[PDB]
């Protein structure tokens, strides 16, 4: 129940984020089997391809719900990883990019 225009703009932000050089940790779900410990720290895993699926299948009724899942990607990364790492910096850079891109779009 996002209209055509909102669906379109969220889809563009997701593609822009997918293209960004700091997007590499977030493209696909964390593999719970080879990151033992992940799931005991992280209550709800989330990544961009799951967001894409949920967007394409009508699971986001409005703009806020979509933004909520995007933030959860970067909150998960910050909870799990040291800030002083390539992955930690990647998360902080993508959050900054997203929030600016969100403000400028809406």
């Amino acid at each position: 129940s996002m209209d055509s225009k909102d669906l379109a703009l969220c889809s563009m932000i997701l593609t822009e984020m997918e293209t960004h050089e700091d997007a590499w940790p977030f493209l696909l779900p964390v593999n719970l089997k080879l990151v033992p410990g992940y799931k005991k720290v992280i209550k709800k895993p989330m990544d961009f391809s799951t967001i894409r699926e949920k967007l394409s299948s009508g699971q986001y009724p409005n703009l806020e719900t979509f933004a909520l899942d995007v933030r959860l990607v970067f909150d998960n990364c910050e909870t799990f990883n040291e800030d002083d790492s390539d992955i930690g910096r990647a998360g902080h850079n993508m959050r900054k990019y997203f929030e600016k891109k969100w403000t400028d779009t809406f």
């Binding site: 410990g37 799990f80 990883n81 040291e82 992955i87």
Partner: peptide, 8 residues
């Protein structure tokens, strides 16, 4: 895989 866990 690219991870830098705070714990462990």
């Amino acid at each position: 895989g690219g991870k830098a866990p705070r714990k462990q």
